[PDB]
Design a protein around this motif. Structure first.
Motif, mmCIF file in Angstrom:
data_model
loop_
_atom_site.group_PDB
_atom_site.id
_atom_site.type_symbol
_atom_site.label_atom_id
_atom_site.label_comp_id
_atom_site.label_asym_id
_atom_site.label_seq_id
_atom_site.Cartn_x
_atom_site.Cartn_y
_atom_site.Cartn_z
ATOM 1 N N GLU A 27 -16.266 26.515 -9.909
ATOM 2 C CA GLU A 27 -17.731 26.709 -9.332
ATOM 3 C C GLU A 27 -17.382 27.961 -7.567
ATOM 4 O O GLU A 27 -16.278 27.839 -7.257
ATOM 5 N N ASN A 72 -23.176 22.415 -8.008
ATOM 6 C CA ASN A 72 -24.749 22.792 -7.191
ATOM 7 C C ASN A 72 -25.116 23.690 -6.957
ATOM 8 O O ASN A 72 -26.040 24.368 -6.358
ATOM 9 N N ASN A 172 -27.325 22.444 -13.852
ATOM 10 C CA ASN A 172 -26.756 21.605 -13.191
ATOM 11 C C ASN A 172 -27.312 20.197 -12.580
ATOM 12 O O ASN A 172 -28.423 20.247 -12.579
ATOM 13 N N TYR A 244 -16.376 10.265 -10.071
ATOM 14 C CA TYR A 244 -15.009 11.048 -9.366
ATOM 15 C C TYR A 244 -14.670 9.486 -9.338
ATOM 16 O O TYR A 244 -15.333 8.503 -8.899
ATOM 17 N N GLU A 292 -17.706 16.652 -15.441
ATOM 18 C CA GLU A 292 -16.988 16.754 -14.128
ATOM 19 C C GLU A 292 -15.940 15.229 -14.169
ATOM 20 O O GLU A 292 -16.939 14.179 -13.756
HETATM 21 C C1 LIG Z 1 -20.630 18.110 -8.905
HETATM 22 C C2 LIG Z 1 -21.216 19.308 -9.439
HETATM 23 O O1 LIG Z 1 -21.634 20.431 -10.342
HETATM 24 C C3 LIG Z 1 -20.321 20.411 -8.542
HETATM 25 O O2 LIG Z 1 -21.188 21.439 -7.671
HETATM 26 C C4 LIG Z 1 -20.121 19.283 -7.777
HETATM 27 C C5 LIG Z 1 -17.862 19.341 -6.933
HETATM 28 O O3 LIG Z 1 -17.251 19.229 -8.744
HETATM 29 C C6 LIG Z 1 -20.046 17.718 -7.586
HETATM 30 O O4 LIG Z 1 -21.173 17.127 -6.657
HETATM 31 S S1 LIG Z 1 -21.197 16.696 -5.864
HETATM 32 O O5 LIG Z 1 -22.887 16.109 -5.967
HETATM 33 O O6 LIG Z 1 -19.950 16.858 -5.038
HETATM 34 O O7 LIG Z 1 -20.567 14.811 -6.805
#
Ligand SMILES: *[C@@H]1[C@H](O)[C@@H](O)[C@H](CO)[C@H]1OS(=O)(=O)O
Length: 500
Positions: A27, A72, A172, A244, A292
């Motif tokens: 990103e 994002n 996204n 995550y 992710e």
């Molecule tokens: C998941 C999003 O697509 C990313 O931009 C980000 C980091 O990998 C993740 O979102 S979050 O809002 O940070 O969890």
């Protein structure tokens, strides 16, 4: 010690593994691009400003597909801002990460970088501030050969041959109140449906990923996926899911059990896909893009000190430790266990940002603890995932009952006449004596037994030293159609067998 058994039966198969389960993600976030892949001042920069050291570390992971440019970020991004002459590219406020984006890198330069690491690109379209016209125009720009305004514009920007991008993300994760241009499941399903159609009318060869929930704890979790698929099913190919993990309570035994939750989560999203398939009477099966996944928690306090409106702030720079590598290994095994329905996955993210590869300005690039199980899974985990039938001792933790000490799967590569057993021993005190019944693999021998272990679960790697690294002193041995292997306490193991 404790004992565990596993049957490795050639004819008890899950599915061929799609190599795109070893994907990743870059990103426009923090130093992933600026100071990560691209650093014109650097002694190892190539003619185009790309860091050669990072290129070699990505090539060694054999990453087949990279999601880009977000995330994002994409929900507020204008793709035209990143193409054509640099003097005309505007500086923007990225509201996702509260950063100034110079657009010095845009999509054509990213494609150039992707070609050097041998990865295809999973390109995302903005469905936050933009919609269906921008989606068809971007596919035309990238994929239509010539003879239209946007194809000829790509040619004028220096890219005669079309990029020919196969797999696209429809926005996204738009379900979150912190997202630019958040949409309800109905609003998103509608715009994704109409975007998907115009994209495929430009280029019917493409496939589309519709976005699932930001996380399994969302109030709209599962409802979201069912509604979005109800709106999009006939036009799309995958649904995404995101996870995550972190060890905020310093409870190693409960932390290493979290892949059991990931297993359930995948089964849930598959069920939603198959519900909507039945409701539509469709012959098409929708698969999953786990676009992710990672460990993420260590950098949360540091990020709070970053002032807004800098260029390339050092955001999301987790420094991983050994237990984090063990959980990554359990997550990889969990992806392989679902090879039938998870066809794409993206370790989020590839460089600097919650990443297996870290860089220093004008300095080294180095491998985090989590680099090693990912490399092993990508390199040795191509073939058919076999159904494991395991007898393991078990433990209870704060949040999980009947957690097996053994997390394992075998992958059979018939072309290479190889079987690879991936195994984690979660036990914090005892080795596990693993016995594998390999009667169905006649004339197979042990090739190697790789072990990742460290006495200190909190030990990290750094640019100056790598105390957490694999060794090949695993004792796996084949006797009487049985592989016997000692899995040390708190270890990741790769037991490679081959016909000899
Ligand atoms: C998941 C999003 O697509 C990313 O931009 C980000 C980091 O990998 C993740 O979102 S979050 O809002 O940070 O969890």
């Amino acid at each position: 010690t404790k004992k565990a058994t596993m049957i490795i039966e050639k004819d008890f198969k899950i599915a061929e593994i799609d190599k795109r389960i070893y994907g990743s993600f870059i990103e426009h976030l923090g130093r992933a691009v600026y100071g990560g892949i691209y650093e014109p001042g650097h002694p190892q920069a190539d003619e185009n400003g790309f860091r050669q050291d990072v290129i070699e570390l990505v090539k060694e992971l054999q990453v087949p597909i990279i999601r880009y440019p977000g995330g994002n970020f994409v929900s507020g991004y204008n793709w035209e801002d990143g193409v054509g002459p640099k003097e005309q590219r505007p500086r923007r406020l990225d509201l996702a990460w509260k950063s100034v984006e110079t657009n010095e890198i845009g999509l054509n330069e990213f494609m150039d970088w992707a070609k050097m690491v041998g990865a295809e690109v999973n390109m995302a379209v903005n469905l936050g501030t933009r919609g269906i016209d921008a989606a068809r125009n971007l596919v035309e720009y990238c994929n239509h050969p010539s003879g239209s305004y946007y194809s000829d514009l790509r040619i004028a920007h220096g890219y005669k041959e079309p990029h020919k991008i196969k797999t696209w993300c429809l926005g996204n994760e738009m379900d979150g109140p912190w997202q630019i241009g958040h949409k309800t499941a109905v609003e998103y399903g509608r715009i994704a449906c109409e975007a998907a159609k115009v994209m495929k009318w430009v280029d019917p060869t493409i496939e589309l990923v519709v976005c699932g929930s930001s996380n399994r704890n969302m109030p709209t979790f599962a409802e979201w996926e069912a509604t979005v698929l109800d709106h999009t099913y006939d036009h799309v190919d995958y649904i995404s899911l995101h996870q995550y993990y972190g060890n905020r309570d310093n409870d190693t035994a409960n932390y290493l059990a979290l892949s059991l939750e990931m297993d359930d989560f995948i089964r849930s999203v598959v069920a939603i896909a198959d519900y909507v398939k039945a409701k539509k009477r469709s012959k098409k099966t929708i698969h999953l893009s786990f676009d992710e996944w990672n460990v993420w928690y260590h950098s949360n306090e540091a990020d709070k000190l970053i002032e807004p409106w800098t260029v390339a702030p050092p955001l999301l720079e987790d420094i991983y430790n050994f237990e984090d590598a063990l959980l990554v290994g359990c997550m990889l095994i969990t992806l392989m266990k679902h090879a039938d329905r998870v066809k794409i996955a993206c370790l989020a993210q590839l460089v600097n940002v919650i990443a297996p590869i870290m860089t220093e300005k004008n300095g080294p690039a180095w491998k985090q603890t989590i680099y090693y199980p990912f490399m092993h899974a990508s390199v040795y985990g191509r073939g058919v995932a076999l159904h494991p039938v395991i007898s393991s001792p078990k433990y209870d933790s704060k949040d999980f009952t009947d957690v097996p000490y053994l997390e394992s799967i075998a992958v059979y590569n018939e072309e290479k006449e190889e079987v690879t057993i991936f195994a984690v021993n979660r036990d914090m005190e005892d080795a596990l004596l693993l016995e594998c019944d390999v009667r169905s693999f006649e004339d197979y021998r042990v090739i190697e037994h790789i072990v990742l272990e460290h006495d200190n679960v909190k030990q990290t790697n750094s640019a100056q030293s790598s105390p957490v690294v694999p060794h090949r002193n695993g004792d796996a041995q084949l006797s009487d159609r049985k592989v016997s292997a000692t899995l040390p306490k708190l270890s990741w193991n790769v037991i490679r067998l081959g016909k000899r």
